[PDB]
Amino acid sequence: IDVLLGADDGSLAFVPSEFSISPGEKIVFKNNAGFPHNIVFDEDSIPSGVDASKISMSEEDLLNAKGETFEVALSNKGEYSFYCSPHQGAGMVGKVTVN
Ligand SMILES: [Cu+2]
């Protein structure tokens, strides 16, 4: 599934921000608008036993040009909360469910 970082009107959101996937399906996050942007998974808000480090950017790593992507695949089922560290306060957050 593709997820935009930044809406086409420059809003600071994931598009889509809530979605479901199958195990091992890829998520491609692509730098769209209002960068820099990143994707960090919340260690306290993903399935038990998952290593967030494995599926996130570092807090300090950024995508700062149009069309940069980060790709990840999830396999454990459950809900995964994620956010953009620099724009978390702006409401740039999301949640994916692996079902
Ligand atoms: Cu962002």
UniProtKB/Swiss-Prot annotation:
Annotated ranges, domain Plastocyanin-like: 1-99
Membrane topology: Peripheral membrane protein
GO cellular component: chloroplast thylakoid lumen; chloroplast thylakoid membrane
Residues the record lists as binding Cu cation: 37, 84, 87, 92
Localization (cell): Plastid, Chloroplast thylakoid membrane
Residue runs in coiled coils: none
Record key words, sorted: Chloroplast, Copper, Electron transport, Membrane, Metal-binding, Plastid, Thylakoid, Transit peptide, Transport
Function summary: Participates in electron transfer between P700 and the cytochrome b6-f complex in photosystem I.
This protein's name: Plastocyanin A, chloroplastic
Source organism of this protein record: Populus nigra
Highest classification ranks of the organism: Eukaryota, Viridiplantae, Streptophyta, Embryophyta, Tracheophyta
Underlying gene: PETE
Whole sequence portion shown: 70 to 168 of 168
